[PDB]
Each structure stands twice: as structure tokens, then as C-alpha cells.
Amino acid sequence: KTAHSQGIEGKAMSEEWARYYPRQFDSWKKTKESDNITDMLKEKPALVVAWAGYPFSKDYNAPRGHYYALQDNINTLRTGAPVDGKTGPLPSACWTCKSPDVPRIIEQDGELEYFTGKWAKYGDEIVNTIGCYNCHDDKSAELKSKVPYLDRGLSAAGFKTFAESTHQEKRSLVCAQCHVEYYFKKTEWKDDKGVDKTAMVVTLPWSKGISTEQMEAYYDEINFADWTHGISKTPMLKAQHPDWELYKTGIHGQKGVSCADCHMPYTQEGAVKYSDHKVGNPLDNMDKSCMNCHRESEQKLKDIVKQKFERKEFLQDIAFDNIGKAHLETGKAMELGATDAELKEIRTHIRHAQWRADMAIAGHGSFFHAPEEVLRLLASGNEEAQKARIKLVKVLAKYGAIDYVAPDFETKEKAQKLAKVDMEAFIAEKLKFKQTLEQEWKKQAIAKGRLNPESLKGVDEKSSYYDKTKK
Amino acid sequence: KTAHSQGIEGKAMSEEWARYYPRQFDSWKKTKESDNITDMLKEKPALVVAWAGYPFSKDYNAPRGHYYALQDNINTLRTGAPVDGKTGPLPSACWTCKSPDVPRIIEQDGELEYFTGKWAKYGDEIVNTIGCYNCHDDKSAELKSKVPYLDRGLSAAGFKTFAESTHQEKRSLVCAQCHVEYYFKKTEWKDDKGVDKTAMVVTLPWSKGISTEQMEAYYDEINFADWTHGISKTPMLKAQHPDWELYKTGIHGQKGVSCADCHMPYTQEGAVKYSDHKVGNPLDNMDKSCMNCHRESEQKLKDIVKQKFERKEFLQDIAFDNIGKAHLETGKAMELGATDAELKEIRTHIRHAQWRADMAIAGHGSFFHAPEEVLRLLASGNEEAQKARIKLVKVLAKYGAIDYVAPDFETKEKAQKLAKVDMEAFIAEKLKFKQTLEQEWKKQAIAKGRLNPESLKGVDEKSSYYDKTKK
Ligand code: HEM
Ligand code: HEM
Ligand code: HEM
Ligand code: HEM
Ligand code: HEM
Ligand code: HEM
Ligand code: HEM
Ligand code: HEM
Ligand code: HEM
Ligand code: HEM
Ligand SMILES: O=S([O-])[O-]
Ligand SMILES: O=S([O-])[O-]
Ligand SMILES: [Ca+2]
Ligand SMILES: [Ca+2]
Ligand SMILES: [Y+2]
Ligand SMILES: [Y+2]
Ligand SMILES: [Y+2]
Ligand SMILES: [Y+2]
Ligand SMILES: [Y+2]
Numbered sequence A, B: 001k002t003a004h005s006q007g008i009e010g011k012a013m014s015e016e017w018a019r020y021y022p023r024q025f026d027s028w029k030k031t032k033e034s035d036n037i038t039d040m041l042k043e044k045p046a047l048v049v050a051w052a053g054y055p056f057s058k059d060y061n062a063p064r065g066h067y068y069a070l071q072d073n074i075n076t077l078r079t080g081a082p083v084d085g086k087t088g089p090l091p092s093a094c095w096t097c098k099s100p101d102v103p104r105i106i107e108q109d110g111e112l113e114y115f116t117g118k119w120a121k122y123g124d125e126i127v128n129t130i131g132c133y134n135c136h137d138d139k140s141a142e143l144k145s146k147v148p149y150l151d152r153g154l155s156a157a158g159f160k161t162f163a164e165s166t167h168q169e170k171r172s173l174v175c176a177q178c179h180v181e182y183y184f185k186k187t188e189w190k191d192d193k194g195v196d197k198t199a200m201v202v203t204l205p206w207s208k209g210i211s212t213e214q215m216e217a218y219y220d221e222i223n224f225a226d227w228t229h230g231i232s233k234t235p236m237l238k239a240q241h242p243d244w245e246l247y248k249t250g251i252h253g254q255k256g257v258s259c260a261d262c263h264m265p266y267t268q269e270g271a272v273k274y275s276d277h278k279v280g281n282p283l284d285n286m287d288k289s290c291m292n293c294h295r296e297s298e299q300k301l302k303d304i305v306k307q308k309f310e311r312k313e314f315l316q317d318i319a320f321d322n323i324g325k326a327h328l329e330t331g332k333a334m335e336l337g338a339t340d341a342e343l344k345e346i347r348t349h350i351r352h353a354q355w356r357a358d359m360a361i362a363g364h365g366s367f368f369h370a371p372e373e374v375l376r377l378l379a380s381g382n383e384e385a386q387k388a389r390i391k392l393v394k395v396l397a398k399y400g401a402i403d404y405v406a407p408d409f410e411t412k413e414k415a416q417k418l419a420k421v422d423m424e425a426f427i428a429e430k431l432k433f434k435q436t437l438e439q440e441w442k443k444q445a446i447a448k449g450r451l452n453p454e455s456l457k458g459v460d461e462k463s464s465y466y467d468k469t470k471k
Helices: A022-033 A046-050 A066-075 A101-109 A148-156 A167-176 A212-221 A243-247 A259-263 A282-289 A298-336 A340-361 A371-398 A412-418 A423-448 B022-033 B046-050 B066-075 B101-109 B148-156 B167-176 B212-221 B243-247 B259-263 B282-289 B298-336 B340-361 B371-398 B412-418 B423-448
Strands: A183-190 A196-203 A266-269 A272-275 B183-190 B196-203 B266-269 B272-275
Touching (some): A022 A066, A046 A298, A066 A423, A148 A167, A148 A196, A167 A243, A259 A282, A298 A340, A298 A371, A298 B371, A340 A371, A371 B298, A371 B371, B046 B298, B046 B412, B066 B423, B148 B196, B167 B243, B167 B259, B212 B340, B259 B282, B282 B298, B298 B340, B340 B371
Antiparallel strands (some): A183 A196, A266 A272, B183 B196
């Protein structure tokens, strides 16, 4: 039993847990150190063509420290510029994996109500970032999954629920509350007062299993599309950080090595063992993260990972180049008057190509977590994309355009022009929101006592569209 | 110093070494146990289209035990049906990696003379299979490379020579005398008696380095082709078992684990350590071959290898399907009258596609030795093949044939018809050779005392074209 056996008042605010766990609080806060913004649309402008007609063609950066998750949610152009709790492009579900205020609100209002409405609905309530309460019971301090969709997905794919799993299983599943692929399943429901509502509910596409191909069958069976492509009008699927599913999968996952083993390694101090809560890049910390199970140099091992990264880049760039070309060639065929029936098989190829390639690259550690599956997926994706292009040559031929050359998209600017993204307009609208409604959120939350301004230190210094310089 | 410090009379005949090393002799002979013939043209008839116009479109089986190497050389349809020492399709170099009689003849007649003439030249001389004298000095019993091309290649690629290497390096290099990619470099020379000769000399394509792409540049720079494709008339490159180069490469090679560690593991008996000379499949022997360095089950580890194999199959089948189609589409474009200039870029793509995919699959353990490089290569190959096909669609369009569908090649029979291989004729001609000149070889060698008929026990019971049933 703990020094807080009856619970913690203000549990959602990680700082409340500091009185019991100063060591874990101090390392947890250090993810403030991972403050770099890598604009992935800038590195990989092919992704803009890929995501044409979708919010990720606006703004898409690489992950940084958990210290930034809530602010990044607010900052991304993907969440747009709500003017109140009923406006803005995105639903309430976008909060789900960013805040210990999520379980707080779910446990107070119910899952369906939580998943009902606009992201802006909870702006002055969902104010704390990735916190102790996302992973830990506030009485026992035991690892807990705080989100019901995870057990739902687990069961569906035949795994044990969180409660049913081993401790070593749990040390990965806590991560898997967030670090998995999801879709929003539009859900009709009735409240306590009898009103008709519609919830958009986080759903793990795991009921045929956790492989890319099994999820592909899942989505195909239900004829699901995340968006209709802005250039090719293909019914598209978006992969988002299938980190756990692919880790599963890979030799370390197979061997039973948990996420926490590399990302939260132990420091022994006599009778007391302590987990590093500074979740970051394990290569920054190889003695503790790797060298319990690996003999031989840090350096050789860092070089082996670099080599994996470069193999992944190689196949990634190929796949997304042919994916991009295929979308563009398809838009061209459309302009020339080619029919839906004439393009249906092409579009199915593009949908599958991109599903597989996105599933490979959407988890930023997968190139390491499951290198062979990653390469196999990117190679499989590219093959679908190439089959699309061979068929496209013929369709273009049929309409007099066999010599058509898809435009280039080697810069983010050129790519966003093709995708018809008025980023400037979006940034302007965004800043206005940050300057007005965002500050009203943070002011109100601080007044209500839901937010401690200590947690805002350097959290809002950078985004893909500004950089004050300091974070 | 050894019990044979002055050398061994009849060193080429491994049985001569038995008086000193009964334990190693007994396990060495046990590779007679690996007697299965897997006709790879039957499993993978796409390889017939790939090798159209080349001997491997006749006969190509998977490796079996070293006990069979010399007889398989004699049996393969690739060596055809010489009627004497000046006939038959293939040169003397085909003996090089099959027999301890090779170093014997090189050391007696010189490298250039050895490499001068037809394979049939040495039929009654090269009569012992893979023997102690291929790897061991007959005075010290120390590991030795017996072939000068290996050090030549080693130096060229910047590695230490055999003599310069560590013992653990040597325990892989002994294998690398044979288990590497090679080409025959036509070489003009003058003998002792002043006559003009031409040697076809085994050359490691390693002077730009040992990567697939480095060898590709090697061959491109010299405008080298192994054959001109029988269907597409592409200048082709043949990969042959780049086992060492790819192992190099892979995590085990990187970590310094030698071929001998898995393939020739140790048995400790007090003061005495003994290497298993039965070179075979290490999964048959996992306690000794794997479980010194791996904790956890044999079974999980066997399952992990199976999974690698199936990923390799998946990308292999894709690549060789598009390679096959590309050759066929190219032959079709030729029939319609397309020009060399119109096909040059296509052909370059096909040459590179197949070079890379063949380099991936030509070493039968590479899917395990270097799984990530294997997948990356097959994915790279397929991409070249797909680029070829997109360009081909246009060339076919230009000649009225945009709707052309390449024939299928899903059986060896169908594939050999397309490749114009009269296998029946070849088999008939072969049997005649085995029934006459082959038996004269073996009779004469046994008379001269170069061959002990004990070594022929069950060695000639099977091939791709007969099976007496017993081996
Ligand atoms: C111990 C289990 C977890 C592991 C191993 C893990 C791993 C990581 C890593 C390595 C990063 C990037 C950090 C960096 O750039 O150095 C990251 C970022 C992120 N993680 Fe986790 N994580 C875990 C738990 C969670 C949970 C439970 C959630 C959801 C509540 C979550 C949501 C996020 C988000 C939203 C980001 C991006 C943050 C940003 O860019 O601002 N993670 N995680
Ligand atoms: C559409 C609603 C959502 C929005 C607008 C949103 C926003 C973001 C942003 C801005 C990032 C930082 C990197 C980037 O710029 O992309 C991020 C990363 C992340 N998000 Fe979300 N999020 C949404 C839904 C979700 C959900 C439902 C989950 C969990 C089931 C989740 C989990 C994560 C995780 C684990 C990362 C870090 C790993 C990575 O980025 O690859 N997010 N999200
Ligand atoms: C400041 C907030 C946090 C506090 C006060 C806290 C507290 C603790 C404590 C007391 C332990 C046990 C001792 C130890 O291993 O150090 C622990 C371990 C652990 N925590 Fe946290 N934690 C926090 C944040 C988080 C979050 C957000 C996650 C999930 C993403 C998480 C996941 C884990 C994991 C996986 C272990 C390993 C436990 C084991 O080995 O069984 N922690 N934490
Ligand atoms: C399912 C459990 C795991 C999760 C959720 C997880 C999460 C992640 C994330 C989000 C990243 C991207 C970091 C970034 O670029 O922002 C990453 C990378 C990485 N992870 Fe994991 N990881 C898990 C398991 C593991 C394990 C078991 C290991 C070691 C065996 C490991 C080691 C690494 C390494 C070496 C990288 C690349 C370095 C980096 O980019 O940070 N991870 N992981
Ligand atoms: C970020 C730190 C780590 C790095 C960079 C790393 C690196 C590697 C690499 C490159 C492999 C080869 C597998 C492949 O091709 O993907 C491997 C295998 C393996 N690693 Fe890790 N690893 C790390 C952490 C760990 C930890 C914490 C454990 C133990 C709990 C572990 C145990 C293993 C095991 C058991 C294998 C399978 C090979 C074997 O049986 O020894 N690793 N690791
Ligand atoms: C210790 C170093 C070596 C290793 C690890 C090795 C490995 C192997 C393996 C695993 C096989 C297939 C056996 C089976 O089917 O179970 C094989 C076959 C073969 N090896 Fe080696 N080998 C080595 C040395 C050599 C040498 C020095 C030569 C050349 C003189 C050679 C030439 C061959 C040939 C020609 C075959 C195919 C034989 C046939 O199908 O009849 N190997 N080797
Ligand atoms: C063109 C001349 C040659 C011929 C006719 C020939 C014949 C054969 C045959 C019949 C096999 C058994 C498997 C099969 O049916 O393909 C084989 C395998 C093998 N040969 Fe050759 N050989 C030649 C040149 C070479 C050379 C020069 C080397 C060494 C530098 C070599 C090394 C090997 C090795 C290591 C294998 C077993 C590995 C594998 O087959 O993938 N061979 N060869
Ligand atoms: C019947 C013929 C052979 C005999 C009598 C023989 C003899 C021996 C002896 C006495 C040893 C040292 C003790 C031991 O480790 O068992 C040895 C080891 C070894 N032999 Fe052989 N050998 C034969 C065939 C071969 C062949 C054809 C190869 C090459 C393909 C080969 C490669 C090796 C290797 C790699 C070792 C390991 C030595 C070490 O660990 O340093 N042997 N052999
Ligand atoms: C360059 C050194 C090596 C050579 C020349 C070599 C040779 C080969 C050959 C020719 C095969 C194909 C067997 C067949 O299907 O006929 C093979 C497969 C295999 N080798 Fe190696 N090998 C080497 C290194 C290693 C090492 C270091 C390991 C273990 C770490 C290993 C383990 C295996 C395994 C598990 C297979 C697949 C099982 C099989 O098909 O026999 N090899 N090797
Ligand atoms: C045929 C028997 C063996 C099998 C089936 C096997 C299997 C594996 C596998 C699957 C990996 C993961 C790397 C990958 O993805 O390719 C690995 C890594 C590794 N193996 Fe092996 N292996 C064998 C023999 C050996 C031996 C004899 C040694 C030691 C001399 C060894 C030492 C290692 C090392 C050092 C790693 C790197 C991961 C680590 O650092 O632990 N293996 N092995
Ligand atoms: O948008 S979040 O799922 O990465
Ligand atoms: O023909 S031999 O090089 O496998
Ligand atoms: Ca999704
Ligand atoms: Ca070659
Ligand atoms: Y308190
Ligand atoms: Y990062
Ligand atoms: Y004797
Ligand atoms: Y075999
Ligand atoms: Y691997």
C-alpha cells in the first residue's frame, strides 16, 4: 500500500504526484528536453501529395517530448482555428492521447459524451499534458490502462485484456493506450436526458488481427475511407503511429522485450529500483537502454541502427515517389474524362499501396522496432503503386496523353501547391485563434484550478510555423 | 607440429587424412546425408524466363551436401555432354569449387593452364569431391585458402589477405574460396613452350567493394555481360551464391560470428575440442549451432527463421514476376520492330533489376544471413523491373500493342517453352555422356589411383532428371 491509499486530489495534474514520487516526477518532466520540431512535410514533401485533401497535408511534424503533446495538439494546423466550443474542423477525440484530463473527463461524463462534439468543446478542461494519471492508478500506483478502447481492441484481436496480462506485458500496454493505429467510428447514442447524439469514437482496427494486411481487410470490409483523395479521388486510409502493433511483430517484441525496457530503463540503488521517466530516444542512453542485453560497443550498435534507418529511407522514398506519381496521373486521367469505372482498380491499388507504405513509416521507431516488416511493407506498397501506374499508362493512352509527365513535388511548397493547400491562410487563422481563444482557455483553466502555469514553461515556443527559439 | 609434418601422400583424396583425423573424417563424410535434390526451376519457374539463353534455364537445383558437389557438377545439364577433352559447352573453371583435385592441378600446372580449356579437359583428373585439402595445409593442418583468386579479390576490396586475417576471419574465409560471386575473365597468356593460349579465369567482382551495387558498377564499367538474354536480348549479369559477401553485411557477420560457428560448431570433450565437419542446415542442430549465444527456445528461434524465409519468398515472387514480364514484353516489342535505341534504357533497367534480385536469392541462406539486405535488394530489383515495364507500355503502345499480355510461366514446362529449351534433347545427350565418357573418366581415374571407388557410394543416384531412389 502507498502513501496515497485513498487517492490523490487533483490527480490529473501530474505535479500533485510529486509529493510522493519526486524522482519519477523529475525525470518525467525532463521530456521537456526533447523540444525539436522536425517538419516532416519539409523533409518528405511527397507526403503532402499523399495526404492531399486531408489535414496532414497542412502540418505534420515528427514526435517530440511528452512535455509537448498537449501544446502540439493545440498548435498543429490540423486542429485549425475554432472560434468557440462548437467550431473548428476536428472532433473531441483528438484530445484522447494528449492528456491525463481525458480519463478525468471520461470517468466524470462517460465515454460517449467525451467522444461527442468538437475538439474545441474541452479546450478549458483538457489542459494537462501526458501525465502520471495516464498510466498509474492514483491509489495503488499500479500500471493501468485508462482508456476503454484499448481492451476493446485487445479482445477483438484475441489478446488478453490489460488486467489479464503479465506485468511485462503491461509495461508495453501502457504505451499502447496511445501508440497504436486508430480510426474514428461514428456512433449514434442517447444521453441521460434522452437527446439524440453522435459520438466519433476512437476504435482500434484490430478485429481481424494486428497485421497491416489484417487491418487492411478490416477497413475494406466496412468500406471505410478516412478521406477521399484531393487529387485522385481515391478512398484513402490514414495510418497513424502503429508503434505497438509493429513492435509486436519485431524481434524485440517477439522476445518479450517491453517498450519500457528501452524507453524507461532501470537504475538500481541498493534495495531501490527506479525507472527513468524521461521517455525519449534510447540511443541517447545506451548504457542503460541497451547494454544489459547487448555485449560489444555502443558505437557498432548505433551504426547498425543508422544502417536500418537508411534502408528504410531508401524504400520509403521510392514508394512515396510512385504513390505521388500515381495520384497525379490519376487526377490527370480525371481531367481528360476518364470514368470511375475505368479508375476503380487503379484507385484500389493506390489505396492499398499507401495504406501499406504509411503503416510502415507512420511509426517513427518502426524502422528499428520491426525492420524486416517495415521493408517488406514499403516494398509491398511500392508494388501496389507500380501496378497502379502501369494501368494508368493505358488509361492516359486511351485519352491521348500517354506522354504525360506527373509534376514534381520535391519541395513542400511545390507539393502544397499541387495539393491546393493555402498554408499562409491557415497559419494566419491559426495565430488569431492562439492569440484569442487559446489564451482564454488557459486563463480559465488556471482560474478554475485545472492548470498550473508552472507546466507552461517553454511549452509554446515552437511549431512548424513559428519558432521563438528557446523551448 | 602434427603426425604428418612432411605432408600427406595422396593429399587430394580426403580418405588419406583419415589415419590422422578419424573424427573429422567421419563427420565430413556425413554430408552424404544431405542428398535431397530440389529442382529450383520446378519450384520457381520464373527463373527459367529470367535465365533464358543461359545454361541455368536448363538445370538449376538447390545446394545439397558437399559429398555431392563433384557429381552434381558432372550431372547438371549445364555442363552438357562432352564427347572428349575438347568438347562440351563449359570451361575448365567449372571444376574450381568442386574438388580438392583443383589445388592439386593448379600447384602442378599453374593457375593459367588450369584455367585454359574445356571442363572436359580434366574429367579423369578432377575426381574427388570437397575435401580436407580444399581447406587444410597437409603439413600443419592449419586453415588455408587454396585458390589465388580469393586473396586477389580480398585485396581489391581492401580487406586483409587470408594470411593477414585473424583466426576467426579464417573460419569464414575458407568457405569464401567457393561461396562467393565470381565471373570468368577471359585472359590471354603464353606458356613455357611459347604457344598462345586463352584462359577463362575465376575473378571476384570485388574491386569497387562487396556490395551488390558496387559489383554492379564493377560490371557496368567494363561493359560485362554473362549472356545476352534469349528473349529480351538484354546484356545480362548472373549472380552466383554471393554467400560470403552478403553474410558480411548481416548482423552475424557484423558481430564477427563466422560461418564455422553455425555450420561447424564445436563439441567439447575434456581437453579436446572437435569441430563438426558435417556442413549442413544449422537448424538440424540448434543446441550446438545456436544455443551458445541464444537463450530461449529452439522453437521460437526456428519460427523466427521461417518468418524471414516467407518474407523473402513474398518479395522474390513479386520481383521475378515483373522481371519475367519485362523480358517477355521486351521480346514482344522486338517482334513489333522496336529498335535497340528505343529499348536501351528498358534493357538497362532489366539488367539492374535482375542483377539485384538474383544477388538477393542466389545465396540460399542469405534470407537468414542478411535478411534486411535481402529484402532491400528484392524491393530495389522489383523497382527497376517496374520502371522497365512502365517504359515498355509506351513502346508497345507505339507499335499498336498496348493491350499485350505477357504469357504466363507458372510451370517449368511453360517457362522452358518460352525460353526455347529443348530439355528432353539435353537430357538424352547428357545420359549418353554419363553412360560412356563419364564412366571412362571414373574407370581411368580409379586405375591411375586418383579415385577410390569407396567415395562413389550412392553419389550418383539422383539429379533433376533421374532418381534411382536411394543416395
Ligand atoms: C511507456 C510507454 C510510452 C512510450 C515508450 C512512449 C514513447 C514515446 C517516444 C519515444 C516519443 C518521442 C519522444 C522524443 O521525441 O524524444 C513519444 C511521443 C509522444 N507520445 Fe508516447 N510513449 C509512451 C506513452 C504514451 C502515452 C500513454 C501517450 C498518450 C497519453 C503517449 C503519447 C505521445 C504523444 C501524443 C507524443 C508526441 C508528443 C509531441 O510531439 O508533442 N505516449 N512517445
Ligand atoms: C484527429 C485527432 C488528433 C489530432 C489533431 C492529434 C494531433 C497530434 C499531433 C499534433 C502530434 C505531434 C506530431 C505531429 O505534428 O503530427 C501527434 C502525435 C501523436 N498522437 Fe495524435 N492527434 C489526434 C489523435 C490521436 C489519437 C486518438 C491518438 C491515440 C489513440 C493519438 C496519439 C498520438 C501519438 C502516440 C503521437 C506520437 C507518435 C507519432 O506522432 O508518430 N493521437 N498527434
Ligand atoms: C510524474 C508522473 C509519474 C509518476 C509520479 C510515476 C510514478 C511511478 C512509480 C512510483 C513507479 C514505480 C517505481 C519505478 O519504477 O520508478 C513507476 C514506474 C513506471 N511508470 Fe510511472 N509515473 C509517472 C508517469 C508515467 C507515465 C505517463 C507512464 C506511461 C506512459 C508511466 C509508466 C510507467 C512504467 C511503464 C513503469 C515501470 C513499472 C515496472 O517496471 O513495473 N509513468 N512510475
Ligand atoms: C511498443 C513499445 C514501444 C513504443 C510505444 C516505442 C515508441 C517509440 C517511438 C514513438 C519512437 C520514435 C522516436 C522519435 O523519433 O520521436 C521510437 C524509437 C526508437 N525506439 Fe521505441 N518504442 C517501443 C519499444 C522499443 C523497444 C523494445 C526498444 C529497444 C529494444 C526501442 C528502442 C527504440 C530505438 C532504438 C528508437 C530509434 C531512436 C529514436 O528515434 O528515438 N523501442 N520508439
Ligand atoms: C535501444 C537499445 C537497443 C538496441 C539499439 C538494440 C539493438 C539490437 C539489434 C540491432 C538486434 C538485431 C535484431 C534486428 O535486426 O532488429 C537486437 C536483437 C536482440 N536484442 Fe536488442 N537492442 C536494444 C535493447 C535491448 C534490450 C533492453 C534487450 C533485453 C531485454 C534486448 C535484447 C535483444 C534480444 C534478446 C535480441 C535477439 C537476438 C538474441 O537472441 O540475442 N535488446 N538488438
Ligand atoms: C566451412 C566453410 C563452408 C561452409 C559453411 C559451407 C556451407 C555449405 C552449405 C550449408 C551447403 C549446403 C549443404 C546442405 O544442403 O545441407 C554447401 C554446399 C556446397 N558447397 Fe559449401 N561450405 C563451405 C565450404 C565450401 C568450399 C571450400 C567449397 C568449394 C571447394 C564449397 C562448395 C560447395 C558446393 C559446390 C555446394 C553444393 C554441393 C552440391 O549441391 O552437390 N563449400 N556449402
Ligand atoms: C560455370 C562453371 C560451374 C558449373 C557448371 C558449376 C556447377 C554447379 C552445380 C551443378 C551446383 C549445384 C546446384 C545447382 O544445381 O546449381 C553448384 C553449386 C555451387 N557452386 Fe558451382 N559450378 C561452376 C562454377 C563455380 C565456381 C567458379 C565456384 C566458386 C568460385 C562455384 C561454387 C559453387 C558453390 C559455393 C555452390 C553451392 C551454393 C549454391 O549452389 O548456391 N561454382 N555449382
Ligand atoms: C576429411 C577431411 C578433413 C579433415 C581430416 C579435417 C581436419 C580438421 C582438424 C584436425 C581440425 C582441428 C580440430 C577440430 O576443430 O576438429 C579441423 C577444423 C576445421 N576445419 Fe577441417 N578437416 C577436413 C575438412 C574440412 C573442409 C573441407 C573444410 C572447409 C570447407 C574444413 C574447415 C575447417 C574449419 C573452418 C575448422 C575450424 C578450425 C578452428 O576452429 O580454428 N575442414 N579440421
Ligand atoms: C559466410 C559464412 C557462411 C556461409 C558460406 C554459409 C553458407 C550457407 C549456405 C550455402 C546455406 C544454404 C543451405 C541450403 O539451403 O542448402 C546456408 C544457410 C543457413 N545458414 Fe549459413 N553460412 C554462413 C554463415 C552462417 C552463420 C554465421 C550462421 C548463423 C549465425 C548461419 C546459419 C544458417 C542458417 C540458419 C541457414 C538456413 C538453414 C539452411 O537452409 O540450411 N550461416 N548457409
Ligand atoms: C543457426 C543458429 C542461429 C540462429 C537461428 C540465430 C538467430 C538469430 C536471429 C534471428 C537474430 C536476430 C537478427 C536478425 O534479425 O537477423 C540473431 C542475432 C544475433 N545472434 Fe544469432 N543465431 C544463430 C547463431 C548464433 C551464434 C553461433 C552466435 C554467436 C557467436 C550468435 C550471436 C548473435 C548475436 C551476437 C546477435 C545480435 C543480437 C545480440 O547482440 O545479441 N548467433 N540471431
Ligand atoms: O494525429 S495523431 O494520431 O498522430
Ligand atoms: O554454378 S555454380 O557457381 O553455382
Ligand atoms: Ca488510421
Ligand atoms: Ca556472376
Ligand atoms: Y496535493
Ligand atoms: Y523526437
Ligand atoms: Y596414406
Ligand atoms: Y540443401
Ligand atoms: Y533483423
